Amino acid sequence: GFSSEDKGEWKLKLDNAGNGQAVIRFLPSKNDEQAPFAILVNHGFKKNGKWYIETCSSTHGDYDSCPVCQYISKNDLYNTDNKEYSLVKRKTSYWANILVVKDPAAPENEGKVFKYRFGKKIWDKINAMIAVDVEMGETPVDVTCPWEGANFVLKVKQVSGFSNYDESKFLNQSAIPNIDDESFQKELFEQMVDLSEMTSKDKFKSFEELNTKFGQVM
């Protein structure tokens, strides 16, 4: 497998030592009000040498329409079979429209906009920006605001065979340069996808489809 950029999906290029770094900027909601971040739940496991990788409807409260959700529920796997559990458990992913400010490993990406996926560690980092400590001179930040945001420094290094994001961190506040220019603003926005698209009926609402599939995989 390889290159994702061409399809509008950016991924941090890691080097030989599994390390990597960049400066990206999380963009606000394309559309009115809110939701600059998409939250999608799935299940992704291999068993018997087969793979089950599908979206989950728990993503909008509907746990019943998901075979794997029912399985974990009926069998209390969390408790009765914790090994099956961690394998089978639902996975949460977050997506954003981002502006690559600096990408040393691939400079042609800078200034371009892509959709970016991530997990709890970077999500937490985004949330702790609003939950600050006043006694340390901290003030809350909407890192997605084009005028009050803060670029993010994405830094990776392998620990225990796992990418560790501990060096990642938000910089001071600032405005996206040129943001107030209509040509620029509109070219940036032309590059932003509708994140709600990812959370519409992309779920095989045919739990039955999902079930025969879960079936031959199990």
Our finding on whether 40 is near Zn ion (CB under 5 A) is no
**Is 43 known as a binding-site position?**
yes
**Is 69 known as a binding-site position?**
yes
* Closest by CA position to 8, among listed 94, 117, 104: 117
Give min distance, CB of 99 to Zn ion, in A: 33
DSSP-derived 3-state class of residue 134? helix
Our finding on whether 101 is near Zn ion (CB under 5 A) is no
Stretch that binds Zn ion, among 8-16, 69-77, 124-132, 142-150 (CB under 5 A): 69-77
Instruction: Count H helices and E strands in the chain, helices first.
Output: 6, 8
Question: Site for Zn ion (CB under 5 A): which residue of 22, 56, 156, 217?
Answer: 56
Query: How do 20-26 and 38-47 pair as beta strands?
Result: unpaired
DSSP-derived 3-state class of residue 95? strand
Our finding on whether 66 is near Zn ion (CB under 5 A) is yes
Give min distance, CB of 137 to Zn ion, in A: 43
In contact, 52 and 43? CB cutoff 8 Å: yes
d(CA 50, CA 192): 35
60 vs 102, beta carbon nearer Zn ion: 60
116 vs 214, beta carbon nearer Zn ion: 214
52 vs 165, beta carbon nearer Zn ion: 52
